[PDB]
């Protein structure tokens, strides 16, 4: 299953997060979507710590959403990278 980190656009607009879920649904590629801000004004500290650790980053400043990981665990990156991965 792919791992997609991002925003629920109903809480915080992220059109690239939605494009990423639509693409995986078109390819019938099973995925788990991880919402790093489950409520307006509350970050899920545990899943951001998880993400930054996998990306080897000391800070969320600069982080771009969505961030997608392959079923094998490899970091793919953003939406354009995901699109390119299926080509």
UniProtKB/Swiss-Prot annotation:
Keyword Disulfide bond: yes
Variant or mutagenesis effect after changing residue 13 to S: 85% loss of ability to be reduced by thioredoxin reductase
Gene3D superfamilies named in the record: Glutaredoxin
Disulphides: 14-17
Effect the entry attributes to changing residue 21 to Q: Complete loss of ability to be reduced by thioredoxin reductase
Misc: The disulfide bond functions as an electron carrier in the synthesis of deoxyribonucleotides from the corresponding ribonucleotide.
Name the UniProt record assigns to this protein: Glutaredoxin
Lineage, highest ranks first: Viruses, Duplodnaviria, Heunggongvirae, Uroviricota, Caudoviricetes
Encoding gene (name): NRDC
């Amino acid at each position: 299953m792919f791992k997609v980190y991002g925003y629920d656009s109903n809480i915080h607009k992220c059109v690239y997060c939605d494009n990423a879920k639509r693409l995986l649904t078109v390819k019938k590629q099973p995925f788990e979507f991880i919402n790093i801000m489950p409520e307006k004004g509350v970050f899920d500290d545990e899943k951001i710590a998880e993400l930054l650790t996998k990306l080897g980053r000391d800070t969320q400043i600069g982080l771009t959403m969505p961030q997608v990981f392959a079923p094998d665990g490899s970091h793919i990156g953003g939406f354009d990278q995901l699109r390119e991965y299926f080509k």
